[PDB]
Amino acid sequence: YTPVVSHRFMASFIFNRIPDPLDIRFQRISGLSRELQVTQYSEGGENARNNYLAEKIQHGTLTLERGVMTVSPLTWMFDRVLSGEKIAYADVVVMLLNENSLPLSSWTLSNALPVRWQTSDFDANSNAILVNTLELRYQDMRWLGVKI
Template sequence: MSLPIPPLTLDPLIGPALGFRFAVFFFAGGAVPNPIDIRFQRVSGLSASIDTTTIIEGGQNLYTHRLPTRVGYANLVLERGFVVGSPLNLEFNAAMSLFKFAPSNVIVTLLSERHLPLAAWLFIKAYPVRWATADLDANDERLLIDTMELAYTRMQALRI
């Protein structure tokens, strides 16, 4: 006798998480959250990888040894509609115009349909490395998008 296959569900407790409900929190000075800059259209760069070095063993021609050396991270890329009067814009302006950096911790939180946290990614000592605004085009009625890219010291994935 075979057991029935349970139906697929989008219930956050037993089904797959959906990636369109999220918030981004910047912690100025490492502790105080910025309540204005939390809404973004897209977040990418949630990844880490282990760098390796290859060791060749003398007389062994069938394989090499690959040993871990360090953890590497992709830059955190945030995209949102063009915003005026944002503290985050001031930080990016200081970095790009004055070469002054104030690293902050950033947490990206995946939310359930009830807006409860399901998972999070903590980025420690994040600082701006790239800022771009989409092209201005009089023939295109598209939302103007800012792309902000941050480097950071370390990422910690949190499963809540």
């Protein structure tokens, strides 16, 4: 039918089956890619058409940046795991939104491990928002709804 636009979205986190509804305001989210790795096997007298053998599926890496805000249960989670205290998992629910703020489709990203966390640079010469480019690696992705 008709396509949808890419500037309404919210992403909520699930810290140990306890939802996190304070941290849904993000600047951008990376867009979710998955890829089936493929080993090409060429053989014998068949030298006019390829022959591709499937392999394991390689999921992408989810980056999402936000303006730096007051400290929140999202920020206490990344600071806990990137200071070497506790390696813990967090589930991410990324959903599109309608005009009536209803979800079109949602991606649930099970057991996403927070990998890196990077702020923007200070500079005195230009005016811009300090952002928090924080990037986390998920190990499964289960698309759910209508209008994928």
